[PDB]
C-alpha cells in the first residue's frame, strides 16, 4: 500500500508517487535527470527531475535550494511551471533525494536552430524568451545559463525558460560553471557580472538560430575568447583597464582584430524574406544583435531595452513584459554558506513546505 514505488532507468532509481508512470529518460539539469512521465491522475505528460542526495555537498545543496525556491515563487507564462514536489523518504533524519515535477514541453530549442524560421516566428520566440528573462530580473535574479538546451518550446509557438540551479543574484562570490559558448566576456575573463550577462546569452542564442550553428564555438575556455574577438574584434583599451592584470596581459597580448560587421557576420542570405510591415527587417534583427552581442558589459543593452527594440516590440504586451515580480521569501539570500547538516535541514523543510 506504500504511496511510492520504484523503477530502474538504466542504473538510476526513480522512486515516485504511483500516479506518475511510464517513465522515460529525457535529459539533465544543472543537477539531475529529468524524466518524462504520465501523471495518471492529471491525465497529462510531465517532467520529473530527480536530485540525488542534493545536500551531499555545499555546491549541490545550494543549487538545489535555489532551484526549489525559485521554482516555487516564480510565475510567468515564459518560465517553466511547477507541478509538484516530493521525497519518498519518511523523515528529516532518514531523508536523501528530491523530486520535482514540471510541465513537459514539446522540444528544446536545439532543434528550432535547425529549421529556417520566418521573421515573425523568430522575433516572437525571442520576445517570449525576453519576457521570461525580464520576469526573473524584475526580482533581481540572473539565470546565468541560458542556452538552447535550457529553452523549451511547444508547437503552438510558445516558449519557456527552464532549469534554475545555476540562477542567483549579481557579482562574483567557479568561473567555469556556465556553458562555454554562452559565456559573456565578463564571465570568460572572470570579472563578475550583472543582469545583462543574460542578454549576452540571448545574442548567442539568437545568432545561433540565424546561423544554424553555434555562434562562437571555441574548444576550451581559452580558445573561446579567440572566437569572440575573432568575430566582434578586440575590445577597447578603455575596457581592458577593467581586467584583472593577470588576465589583462594575456588579453592585450592576443592578436588584434577589427572584427567583421554584423552585415558581414550575418549576411542577408541567412535571413528569410523581409517583414510584412517594416519592423521585422533582416537588418532590424542585425541592429538588435549589434546591441546584444557587445563585449563591453556596460555598453550592452538590457532586457527592457531589448523589449523596446523595434524587432521585438511588435509583440509588446505590458501584461506580459511588466508583470508583477516574483516575491522571494527574504530570509533567503542565495550565498550564505552552511554545514551539510544545515543544508539538508533547509532543503527538507523546503520540500516539506511544498508537499501537498
Amino acid at each position: 500500500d506504500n504511496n511510492f514505488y520504484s523503477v530502474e532507468i538504466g542504473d538510476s532509481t526513480f522512486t515516485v508517487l504511483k500516479r506518475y508512470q511510464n517513465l522515460k529518460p529525457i535529459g539533465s539539469g544543472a543537477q539531475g535527470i529529468v524524466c518524462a512521465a504520465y501523471d495518471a491522475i492529471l491525465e497529462r505528460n510531465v517532467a520529473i527531475k530527480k536530485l540525488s542526495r542534493p545536500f551531499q555537498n555545499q555546491t549541490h545543496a545550494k543549487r538545489a535550494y535555489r532551484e526549489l525556491v525559485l521554482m516555487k515563487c516564480v510565475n510567468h507564462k515564459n518560465i517553466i511551471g511547477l507541478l509538484n514536489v516530493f521525497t519518498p523518504q519518511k523523515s528529516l533524519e532518514e531523508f536523501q533525494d528530491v523530486y520535482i515535477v514540471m510541465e513537459l514541453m514539446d522540444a528544446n530549442l536545439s532543434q528550432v536552430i535547425q529549421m529556417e524560421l520566418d521573421h515573425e516566428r523568430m522575433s516572437y520566440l525571442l520576445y517570449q524568451m525576453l519576457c521570461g528573462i525580464k520576469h526573473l530580473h524584475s526580482a533581481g535574479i540572473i539565470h546565468r545559463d541560458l542556452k538552447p538546451s535550457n529553452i523549451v518550446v511547444k508547437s503552438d509557438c510558445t516558449l519557456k525558460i527552464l532549469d534554475f540551479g545555476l540562477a542567483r543574484t549579481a557579482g562574483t562570490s567557479t568561473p567555469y560553471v556556465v556553458t562555454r559558448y554562452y559565456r559573456a566576456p565578463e564571465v570568460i575573463l572572470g570579472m563578475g557580472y550583472k543582469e545583462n550577462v543574460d542578454i549576452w546569452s540571448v545574442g548567442c542564442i539568437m545568432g545561433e538560430m540565424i546561423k544554424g550553428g553555434v555562434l562562437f564555438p571555441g574548444t576550451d575556455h581559452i580558445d573561446q575568447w579567440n572566437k569572440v574577438i575573432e568575430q566582434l574584434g578586440t575590445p577597447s583599451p578603455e575596457f581592458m583597464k577593467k581586467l584583472q592584470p593577470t588576465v589583462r596581459t594575456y588579453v592585450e597580448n592576443r592578436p588584434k582584430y577589427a572584427g567583421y560587421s554584423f552585415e558581414k557576420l550575418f549576411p542577408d542570405v541567412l535571413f528569410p524574406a523581409d517583414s510584412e510591415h517594416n519592423k521585422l527587417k533582416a537588418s532590424q534583427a542585425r541592429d538588435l544583435l549589434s546591441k546584444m552581442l557587445v563585449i563591453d558589459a556596460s555598453k550592452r543593452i538590457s532586457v527592457d531595452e531589448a523589449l523596446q527594440h523595434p524587432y521585438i516590440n511588435v509583440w509588446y504586451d505590458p501584461s506580459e513584459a511588466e508583470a508583477p515580480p516574483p516575491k522571494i521569501p527574504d530570509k533567503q539570500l542565495d550565498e550564505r554558506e552552511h554545514t551539510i547538516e544545515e543544508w539538508k535541514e533547509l532543503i527538507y523543510k523546503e520540500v516539506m513546505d511544498l508537499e501537498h
Binding site: 514539446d106 522540444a107 532543434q111 515573425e120 516566428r121 516572437y124 509557438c157 510584412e276 521585422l280 509583440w315
Partner: peptide
C-alpha cells in the same frame, strides 16, 4: 501583425 500559433516540430 498577428502572433503565430503554430510551430512545426516535425
Amino acid at each position: 501583425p498577428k502572433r503565430p500559433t503554430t510551430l512545426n516540430l516535425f
